[PDB]
Write an enzyme that holds these catalytic residues in place. Sequence first.
Site, PDB file in Angstrom:
ATOM      1  N   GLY C  16       0.802  -1.207   0.000  1.00 52.93           N
ATOM      2  CA  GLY C  16       0.000   0.000   0.000  1.00 52.93           C
ATOM      3  C   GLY C  16       0.838   1.262   0.000  1.00 52.93           C
ATOM      4  N   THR C  17       1.003   1.871   1.174  1.00 57.79           N
ATOM      5  CA  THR C  17       1.816   3.074   1.311  1.00 57.79           C
ATOM      6  C   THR C  17       2.758   2.951   2.499  1.00 57.79           C
ATOM      7  OG1 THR C  17       0.113   4.167   2.641  1.00 57.79           O
ATOM      8  CG2 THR C  17       0.077   4.551   0.255  1.00 57.79           C
ATOM      9  N   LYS C  30       2.636  -3.377   8.682  1.00 59.22           N
ATOM     10  CA  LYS C  30       2.003  -3.582   7.386  1.00 59.22           C
ATOM     11  C   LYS C  30       0.491  -3.705   7.562  1.00 59.22           C
ATOM     12  CE  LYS C  30       4.171  -6.036   4.102  1.00 59.22           C
ATOM     13  NZ  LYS C  30       4.694  -7.246   3.397  1.00 59.22           N
ATOM     14  N   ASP C 118      12.121  -9.449  -5.509  1.00 54.93           N
ATOM     15  CA  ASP C 118      11.632  -8.088  -5.700  1.00 54.93           C
ATOM     16  C   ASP C 118      12.716  -7.085  -5.329  1.00 54.93           C
ATOM     17  OD1 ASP C 118       9.885  -6.085  -6.445  1.00 54.93           O
ATOM     18  OD2 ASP C 118       8.709  -6.141  -4.592  1.00 54.93           O
TER      19      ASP C 118
END
EC number: 2.7.11.1
Lengths: 294, 299, 263, 267
Positions: C16-17, C30, C118
């Site tokens: 999300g952010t 988180k 990632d």
Amino acid sequence: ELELDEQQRKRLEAFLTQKQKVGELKDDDFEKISELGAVVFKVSHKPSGLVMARKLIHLEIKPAIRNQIIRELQVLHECNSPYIVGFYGAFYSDGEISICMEHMDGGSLDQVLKKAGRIPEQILGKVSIAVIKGLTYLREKHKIMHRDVKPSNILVNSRGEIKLCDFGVSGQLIDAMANGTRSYMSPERLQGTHYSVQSDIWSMGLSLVEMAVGRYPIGMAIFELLDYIVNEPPPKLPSGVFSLEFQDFVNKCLIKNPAERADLKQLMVHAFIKRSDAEEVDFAGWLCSTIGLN
Amino acid sequence: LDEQQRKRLEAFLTQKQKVGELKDDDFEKISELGAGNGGVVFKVSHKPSGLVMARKLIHLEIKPAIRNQIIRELQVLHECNSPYIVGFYGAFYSDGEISICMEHMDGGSLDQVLKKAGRIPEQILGKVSIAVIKGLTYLREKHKIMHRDVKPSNILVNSRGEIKLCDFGVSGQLIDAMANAFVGTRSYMSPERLQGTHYSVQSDIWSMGLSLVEMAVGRYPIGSMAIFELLDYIVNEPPPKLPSGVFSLEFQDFVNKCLIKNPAERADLKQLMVHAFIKRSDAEEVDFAGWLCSTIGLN
Amino acid sequence: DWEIEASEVMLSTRFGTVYKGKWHGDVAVKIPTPEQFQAFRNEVAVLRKTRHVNILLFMGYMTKDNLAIVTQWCEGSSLYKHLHVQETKFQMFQLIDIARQTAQGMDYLHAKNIIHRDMKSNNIFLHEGLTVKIGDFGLATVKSRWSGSQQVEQPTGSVLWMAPEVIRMQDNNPFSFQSDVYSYGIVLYELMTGELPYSHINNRDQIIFMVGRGYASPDLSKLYKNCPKAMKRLVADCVKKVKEERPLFPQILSSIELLQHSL
Amino acid sequence: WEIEASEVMLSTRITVYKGKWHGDVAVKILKVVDPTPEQFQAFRNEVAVLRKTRHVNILLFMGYMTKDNLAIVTQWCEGSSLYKHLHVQETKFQMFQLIDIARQTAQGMDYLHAKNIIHRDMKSNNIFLHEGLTVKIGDFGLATVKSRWSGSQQVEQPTGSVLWMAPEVIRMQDNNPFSFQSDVYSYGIVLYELMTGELPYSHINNRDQIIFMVGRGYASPDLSKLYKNCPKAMKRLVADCVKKVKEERPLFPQILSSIELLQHSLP
Ligand SMILES: CNS(=O)(=O)Nc1nccc(Cc2c(C)c3ccc(Oc4ncccc4F)cc3oc2=O)c1F
Ligand SMILES: CNS(=O)(=O)Nc1nccc(Cc2c(C)c3ccc(Oc4ncccc4F)cc3oc2=O)c1F
Ligand SMILES: Nc1ncnc2c1ncn2[C@@H]1O[C@H](COP(=O)(O)OP(=O)(O)NP(=O)(O)O)[C@@H](O)[C@H]1O
Ligand SMILES: Nc1ncnc2c1ncn2[C@@H]1O[C@H](COP(=O)(O)OP(=O)(O)NP(=O)(O)O)[C@@H](O)[C@H]1O
Ligand SMILES: [Mg+2]
Ligand SMILES: [Mg+2]
């Protein structure tokens, strides 16, 4: 082609008048009503009372670039056309760029397709005229292409209007957003060739096939889709269902070579456009009946 | 001093003349003699001189100025030469540890000897008392220094029959530095030093008497009690005494006069030296070397 | 075990952010099928296996309300924000030090059979401008004897750091140690050029196609003249199009240490 | 968390070695080839305590080596212990730095107690100033995890440094005199070192006398030697943590709250 009738001229003047009542846009002046999708909210501008659509974009860029994006987005104040979504303003707050635009109560043709299964050919004839005229307006009056034509970026409303949105008006924003599971990109743009409005025409023809048959018409991962676009022949409408003029129209939109592909002038005087322009179709009735509006 | 003592003291200084600047890379470990609260002692060999030394290592985290002041204050040990004092070779710093190199006593400390023997006979303890009282007198008369840490582990003996004191407070900066230590198990502190009142060599006499009782009966006589409870017993309870009829009445009066809680009423070095127990012990011709060697295993 | 009572964790700011909080000091928290529990388990299981100064410190997990993973709050900015936003001017020895610490943490990860999957400068935090912290293990996984059996889903991240075989998605499981190495090589490119790769391409699908087809690769002429030739070779070797030709992180560490002793 | 001994290189001895396992590490190795069953339980308990710590102010545990000699592997902190800064190198810390060291230590202690960890050996030497910035509490060789039967069991004799031991731990009149409040006392003595630059009882150079006088309550740290810069709220905190009565001492949630409030208004 860029001439407006009496009704379109009055609708455009009325939008500008309503736009006059809007001053400086601040985060506090807005009230969230619902979420139209993604992010884009249907919001209310309390000082003016106008319903708007507020798109939020998050970017990690230098502040200077962010400011230039806001300056480049101001050019949307000059993009006034029956076939272009209207623009109220754009600002920065909480780390996100807010783009506030005309609210389209019919949503995107991506949404209309899900509620319709497939869109009739006569309706798509009116869609083709709008996209072609919108692409023509952007080219003639602003010397820009769209860069992202697809069903989700063709919006409609209960007045029967059909407008393009989310075109590349800001070079800095195009560069920043260069970081989706499908793709409507033309072959020449995937291969790094220079490109033009011709690639928008491909994207339109691809969208027309999808809305006509109610299915994304390629083929699967994203790379295999892009490999299919570049190395395989273009899709086409089925032969028995749709008219020959509609078949020839999309085929001239989907020619892989952009120079041999039809241009806007050719498409505007194409037999499919001549026929659909003369046809009297109740698009507003069809839309509200298809979605379930009032 | 007697003829035998004077001859040995010159033999020590003569060998000491062959030892110069002390460096770590010149030392060769031989064994580990022991390890206490402050540090650890090894039997080493000074390869240039070919001598056998005992290298105590004291770990201290101190300013470089404080460690040099300790080395300077330890040089006074070059002047502490006595048959009842362990000899000194040199002191240096290395790898965060101050190395005090001293004379090796192959008999170890009376703490180790008591553990092997179980009990130390009264006649031997007469010789030990004479050695401690004379060592405490030399330090007070020639250097104005009290021992501050008299206990069986700090009374060293050798195969030649010599008995000497060691680990006494010669460096004021080393005393202050080793006050930041861990909690111990036993204690030989006088009551007046525990309570913080004024103290003198009378505290070393109290520690000697307590040590005599520990070596005579074969068990630490205070009190399993914790270190704090042992200190309260020393301060608030009467001192320990030798058993009823196991020893002579002279040893009992000598011990009881050393363990009087009031330091002013307690016997001093002058009185103790002329005490009946010391006069009788100094007249006996005890073969201390044979007792030590047959008890430890030296031959 | 490592569970945190929800009543203790406080949230402060905003998969999300941001979500800064406070649980025994500054922390980061988180934000529903058995697939997402596997998502929580795989990230928590990977995190629980990490205890290394160059790895973001996992501190605990939660279940109540919305699921959460608690980590340390790094003071500073991400490497991305340092390089492309704030334009923090690093000296070449600092750039090589960042490259070393990142390789140190990655080597720690691979040695425990962790694939980050990632890796990108957005997920490398410069803790107080000193210590590299590798974070965001939401896509990470442990290598096992059935990894090839499972059909992975598309990464749906940023294509700039994805290895060509991860873009092509022709195998069931394109991820590997060498795919992490490629991502690391792009991070080296950012350090040793100050720019993101493919500056001339403003088209995500064009990057996906040309990199996947091998028609495009980072422009090595953009490397600083200040950049040692061994470092330039290291970047080129790490972004090799052929998976097997990319060196592993033990080789990366040896190469950097040699050119650092030189300097 | 076991580490294979082949993977670890030992570079420099300072037993403790500066080693190399995926970078610089510290390796505390017990050089004994016949591990007593007591040395075993000590190794396993320290590993068990370290296994429960994941916090920025606690020295990072990385693994243990059982083959060859027993050893514990932690991160290699660059810098010096707080004891070395304060009393050896005599680093000149600003008052806000001193208060920041007090805060970060209370932070780590508040984490440990929240996990029912009693340190039992909190002292200046066991606080490392990593990079000059971050406190790392270390040496858990005496640490224990509080249980139901822990407070009633008879612990062995204390063997740590006298200057930081609470009076009830010196007195040993309880079976287990350790608690959260005994760690608070030790932390208070650390505060005394920060806010005076000196160790307590500098006028007493007798080990046993300190034991006896602190145990009886006759001696206590000289609060008149606190710096003039030291804020009054910080002075009262030092005095609260060092109170002779166990129950009067505050717990670390309150310690943290007080220091944070003072930091918000300090220049
Ligand atoms: C996939 N093709 S691509 O790779 O070329 N990428 C890109 N394509 C196209 C554009 C951009 C950037 C961008 C976007 C996304 C954008 C969105 C909304 C917008 O507001 C309004 N729009 C129209 C009418 C009224 C409005 F209020 C202006 C925008 O202006 C922009 O420039 C791209 F990144
Ligand atoms: C328990 N009582 S207490 O609390 O007063 N502490 C203290 N007691 C007594 C002394 C000290 C310090 C001290 C010590 C420990 C010391 C040890 C060895 C040394 O070498 C030799 N010694 C004698 C002969 C030959 C040598 F090579 C010199 C030493 O010099 C010293 O100054 C104390 F800290
Ligand atoms: N002015 C508007 N009026 C009504 N609905 C809108 C308006 N603008 C956007 N939407 C809706 O919001 C949705 C999200 O838009 P957007 O973020 O551009 O995603 P998109 O159109 O699908 N293109 P992409 O982001 O590449 O997937 C669209 O699909 C529309 O249905
Ligand atoms: N010069 C020496 N020659 C031979 N053995 C020695 C010598 N000095 C010390 N030792 C031995 O080494 C051991 C360790 O001594 P030391 O380090 O002073 O601790 P301790 O006196 O036994 N107890 P503590 O005072 O609490 O540290 C002694 O008990 C002796 O057995
Ligand atoms: Mg859109
Ligand atoms: Mg001794």
